[PDB]
Design a protein around this ligand. Structure first.
Ligand SMILES: Nc1nc2c(ncn2[C@@H]2O[C@H](COP(=O)(O)OP(=O)(O)OP(=O)(O)O)[C@@H](O)[C@H]2O)c(=O)[nH]1
Ligand SMILES: Nc1nc2c(ncn2[C@@H]2O[C@H](COP(=O)(O)OP(=O)(O)O)[C@@H](O)[C@H]2O)c(=O)[nH]1
Ligand SMILES: [Mg+2]
Lengths: 430, 40, 97, 427, 50
């Protein structure tokens, strides 16, 4: 059977994981205690009689977020030792999560993964959730992806990582932990889905009309992106697109595995006033530059590949027509060597709405994941701030003294130099 | 067609065992290993 | 006897539950959701399907016919001015068959 | 007493095959339970071509369902006319090809090919005679493309003197649900040209055009597209299942349509397609079916028939009708526009008449066209293949499963060699 | 099956319409001649209905 195992790392991972598993329960009718009142097998494993537990682990060095889940509204949902805590946090340091304090906890993490892998019949991939800004998501995330590659070979991995914004940052060592974490996910993570914080703040401001959005409001609709991506596995669809469908059809090159995110219909509860949008209008909304989940304009770049995940009552005709209308649009530019790069994944269940959530009920929805050369300026913006701090060798003594060597900082920088280089030449016309 | 079908599916090779014509068996079931027959 | 009877009952109950859910999905129309045609009528031979969708389609066709009859009555009634045929002295009636 | 063994592959073939068995079971009077409840004696006379006799009067189709992921068989078994298929024929994979032609061909196809070959040997050897093999699959996909093409390779090595009628849906210019259709299709045709005895070329955009411009459907669905395929697939086997004034098996249509072994790619079309508004005004007559038969809009291929001359053609009329105006109408089209027909073949068109029309229709005809205009759909597949092969796009996925970049060139060369012998007959 | 004419007599079933006894209807398949008929019908595989 189709089974998936997700791993959530760091403060961003758990709080996204609190939001995502909140939506997975109500999609399948799972009560918060864990009892229903065959599609559930892809995310929940039934234990005993009527008890369903998630196929995910919550590992974090900081114990102040994992106990909030332990005493929150989903205490009975999770297995008691499925959530992994630590005594002390990495404190915004990649060196702590990788060598000194991440080593004692990562061995307990693979024990939970191995017991989850043995329990599921057919495992199809890993959905890793972490933030490269913080120490725990970067360091422990890099080490977990290091051991998972050796232990489980050639198995697909989906990376939903939160990169720091060019404008709004919550820490001064944001570029240091981002650069070092990029070297780990270049050759280990099979698919990296780009996520940015205040890009979603822009989405909530202009589409959800929320004047003061919080991290919880950000995490609710980023959960809808993950659910719409995995909706082919859970429910029957017109053109099913599995996990193994997604890697071999979106990355043209082995090192070009970064893709953007876009969710097309975003309307508030009051903002709907009982209207529906057609397939062509939401398809135009998905490729709108301000509707993307990171702050990169696709006009500067060119779309290397695309993937459209449709939900609800969408006939196969108009989605094929909506592909044709996007192709004739001059503002959206495609690379020359790929003639046809679009996808059609048409599931026939509309996305559900959580009670009290900002999103309104929609009949049809589009999840747009696309490879593009516009990501080259995303890595260059983090490179620009990193070179300012590294030239003066500021905020480095924390990294050097905590096991990590000095000379590997240039090794991680030159890999981003290569990652910036091949983005320019592959998208270059031949 | 129904006539020929019924006669072929009720036909037997030996004529002397037809006297029983005017509980399923173990080999029909090929299962229920401990549940063959019943107590009392 | 209770042990292997319970074992076989669990096996047969699982098999019968699978058969029952497949039969339910067949009879409710959820199964082969890829393959039903739109507008609930046979594409090759222009004949109504044997389903409730076909019955509602026939009802909608009769309603459309009645509306067209009403519009035809309106146009005929306010196209002819007098209750008399102009050429030959005859009554004027709405033509139906 | 001569039969066709049907094999369906992947997402496309299982849905196309389920609609194909929806029509021919309705033609032969088998209910979704399985019992024969038809009301014609000629239906029961030839059942053995497509159905096996079972106990209790039941009939099971002689179909092999194969794929690499179990999503299709949940859908196929749950549909109408879905419980008649044998579960022993339900051979399934677990990983799923995932739109990869190399995965279905070498890596995970190989462990499943030995399983799918045993059920074909179980089904072909169970009868007295084989008319041939019928397969429906895709070329742009991965589940029925890579796995299907190796199946044709092994079944031709074991059964070399038997017919092979392939209904392959090709990648489309207008619509494209995948990114690696030119990669999978070029590798599929290179394996299909020497092995398949004859090929029916289908595409989604011509089926969508028929449902839109001709059949006047506002929102066509894949079920509407698969019904047009199903009517044509049953139309090829019209003379096998039913008597007629002219009889024609798959070999009768083979011998009259391929002058040479390599020109075995045909283009098909179903004649009596009309919207519900104009059915009473239209007089269903042999000149009317012939007029729609040679029309370019009725073709279920991307090839424009006016660009390239027809090499050979076949018409399979169904129903009680006179052969004189059947022969005269195809005589008339040979003389009205002789430039659209090849000059060095006389009597370009073959005709056969069956006296049992399909259900709900007084007359019907199925057209098979061997045209040199079918080179143009292979060029666009070849054009998109060379668009991505010269920059080695998406190639590391293919070389992971064990296929070198060398045999992409003979795949490229045989695509260009197949079309090059098409233009030499167009001149 | 053709529809019966109006005012049909509603004809009685075949067994005691033509006068079969209870012993005959109970042992229809037990008779040796019927057994030989069934044996020959089994022997004629597809030509039994011919
Ligand atoms: N979008 C989003 N971002 C979050 C969320 N929670 C934390 N973040 C991001 O995480 C950054 C803070 O660093 P973290 O990754 O959370 O730190 P950490 O994972 O706890 O690692 P340590 O502090 O060393 O233990 C902030 O800049 C946010 O951008 C969340 O719920 N949603
Ligand atoms: N006519 C028809 N075409 C289909 C159907 N399903 C898929 N396709 C076409 O097949 C292409 C992709 O086929 P795919 O699903 O990859 O086949 P697979 O190899 O078995 O997975 C799409 O472009 C569709 O247009 C169907 O049921 N009917
Ligand atoms: Mg922390």
């Amino acid at each position: 059977m189709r089974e998936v195992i997700s791993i959530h790392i760091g403060q961003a991972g758990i709080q996204v994981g609190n939001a995502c598993w909140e939506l997975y329960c109500l999609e399948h009718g799972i009560q918060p205690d864990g009892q229903m009142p065959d599609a559930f097998n892809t995310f929940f494993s039934e234990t005993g009689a009527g008890k369903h537990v998630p196929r995910c682990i919550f590992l974090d060095l900081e114990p102040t977020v994992v106990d909030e889940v332990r005493t929150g509204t989903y205490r009975q949902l999770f297995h008691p030792e499925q959530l992994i805590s630590g005594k002390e946090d990495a404190a915004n340091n990649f060196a702590r999560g990788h060598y000194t304090i991440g080593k004692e906890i990562v061995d307990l993490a693979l024990d939970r993964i191995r017991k989850l892998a043995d329990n599921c019949t057919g495992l199809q991939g890993f959905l890793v959730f972490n933030a490269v800004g913080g120490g725990t998501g970067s360091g422990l995330g890099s080490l977990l992806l290091e051991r998972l590659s050796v232990d489980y070979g050639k198995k697909s991995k989906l990376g939903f990582t939160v990169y720091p914004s060019p404008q709004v940052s919550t820490a001064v060592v944001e570029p240091y932990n981002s650069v070092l974490s990029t070297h780990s996910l270049l050759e280990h993570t099979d698919v990296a889905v780009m996520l940015d914080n205040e890009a979603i703040y822009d989405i909530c401001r202009r589409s959800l009309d929320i004047e003061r959005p919080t991290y919880t409001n950000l995490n609710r609709l980023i959960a809808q992106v993950i659910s719409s991506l995995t909706a082919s596995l859970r429910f029957d669809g017109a053109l099913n697109v599995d996990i193994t469908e997604f890697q071999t059809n979106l990355v043209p090159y082995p090192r070009i595995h970064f893709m953007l995110s876009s969710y097309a219909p975003i309307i508030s509860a009051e903002k709907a006033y009982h209207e529906q949008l057609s397939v062509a209008e939401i398809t135009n909304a998905a490729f709108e530059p301000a509707s993307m989940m990171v702050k990169c304009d696709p006009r500067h770049g060119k779309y290397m590949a695309c993937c459209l995940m449709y939900r609800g009552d969408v006939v196969p005709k108009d989605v094929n027509a909506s592909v044709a209308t996007i192709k004739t649009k001059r503002t959206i530019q495609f690379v020359d060597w790929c003639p046809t790069g679009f996808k059609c994944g048409i599931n026939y269940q509309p996305p559900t709405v959580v009670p009290g959530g900002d999103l309104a009920k929609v009949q049809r929805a589009v999840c747009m994941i696309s490879n593009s050369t516009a990501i080259g300026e995303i890595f260059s913006r983090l490179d620009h701030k990193f070179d300012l701090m590294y030239a003066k060798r500021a905020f480095v003594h924390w990294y050097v003294g905590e096991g990590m060597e000095e000379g590997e900082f240039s090794e991680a920088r030159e890999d981003l130099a290569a990652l910036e280089k091949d983005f320019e030449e592959v998208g270059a016309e031949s | 067609r129904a006539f020929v079908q019924k006669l072929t599916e009720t036909g037997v090779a030996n004529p002397r065992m037809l006297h029983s014509a005017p509980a399923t068996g173990a080999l029909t079931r090929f299962g229920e290993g401990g549940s063959l027959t019943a107590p009392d | 006897y209770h042990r292997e009877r319970s074992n076989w009952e669990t096996q047969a109950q699982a098999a019968a539950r699978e058969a029952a859910r497949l039969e339910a999905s067949r009879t409710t129309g959820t199964g082969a959701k890829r393959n039903q045609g739109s507008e609930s009528y046979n594409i090759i031979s222009l004949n109504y399907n044997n389903s409730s969708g076909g019955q509602q389609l026939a009802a909608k066709d009769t309603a459309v016919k009645e509306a067209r009859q009403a519009r035809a009555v309106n146009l005929y009634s306010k196209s002819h001015s007098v209750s008399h045929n102009i050429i030959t002295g005859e009554p004027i009636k709405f033509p139906t068959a | 007493m001569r039969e066709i063994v049907h094999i369906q592959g992947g997402q496309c073939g299982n849905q196309i095959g389920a609609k194909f068995w929806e029509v021919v079971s309705d033609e032969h009077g088998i209910d979704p339970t399985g019992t024969y409840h038809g009301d014609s004696d000629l239906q029961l006379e030839r059942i053995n071509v497509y159905f096996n006799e079972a106990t209790g009067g039941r009939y099971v189709p002689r179909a092999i369902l194969m794929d690499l992921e179990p999503g299709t068989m949940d859908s196929v078994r749950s549909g109408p006319y879905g419980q008649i298929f044998r579960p022993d024929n339900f051979v399934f994979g677990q990983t799923g090809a995932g739109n990869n032609w190399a995965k279905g061909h070498y890596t995970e196809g190989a462990e499943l090919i030995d399983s799918v070959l045993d059920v074909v040997r179980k089904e072909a050897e169970s009868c007295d005679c084989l008319q041939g093999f019928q397969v429906c699959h895709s070329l742009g996909g991965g589940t029925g493309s890579g796995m299907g093409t190796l199946l044709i390779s092994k079944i031709r090595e074991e059964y070399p003197d038997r017919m092979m009628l392939t209904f392959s849906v090709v990648p489309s210019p207008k619509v494209s649900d995948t990114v690696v259709e030119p990669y999978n299709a070029t590798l599929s045709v290179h394996q299909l040209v020497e092995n398949a005895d004859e090929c029916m070329v289908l595409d989604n955009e011509a089926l969508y055009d028929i449902c839109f411009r001709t059949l006047k459907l506002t929102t066509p669905t894949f079920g509407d597209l698969n019904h047009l395929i199903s009517a044509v697939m049953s139309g090829i086997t019209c003379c096998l299942r039913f008597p007629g004034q002219l009889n024609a098996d798959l070999r009768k249509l083979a011998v009259n349509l391929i002058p040479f072994p390599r020109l075995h790619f045909f283009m098909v079309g179903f004649t009596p397609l009309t919207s519900r508004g104009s059915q009473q005004y239209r007089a269903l007559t042999v000149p009317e079916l012939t007029q729609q038969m040679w029309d370019a809009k009725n073709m279920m291929c991307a090839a424009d028939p006016r660009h390239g001359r027809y090499l050979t053609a076949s018409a399979l009329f169904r129903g009680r009708m006179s052969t004189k105006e059947v022969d005269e109408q195809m005589l008339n089209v040979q003389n009205k526009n002789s430039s659209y027909f090849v000059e060095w073949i006389p009597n370009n068109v073959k005709s056969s008449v069956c006296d049992i029309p399909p259900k709900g229709l007084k007359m019907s005809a199925t057209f098979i066209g061997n045209s040199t205009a079918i080179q143009e759909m292979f060029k666009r597949v070849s054009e998109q293949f060379t668009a991505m092969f010269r920059r080695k796009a998406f190639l590391h996925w293919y070389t992971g499963e064990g296929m070198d970049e060398m045999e992409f060139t003979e795949a490229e060369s045989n695509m260009n060699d197949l079309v090059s012998e098409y233009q030499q007959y167009q001149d | 099956q053709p529809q019966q004419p109006d005012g049909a007599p509603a004809t009685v079933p075949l067994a005691q319409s033509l006068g079969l006894t209870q012993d005959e209807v109970a042992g229809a398949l037990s008779h040796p001649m019927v057994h030989e008929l069934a044996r020959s019908l089994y022997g004629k595989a597809s030509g039994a209905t011919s």
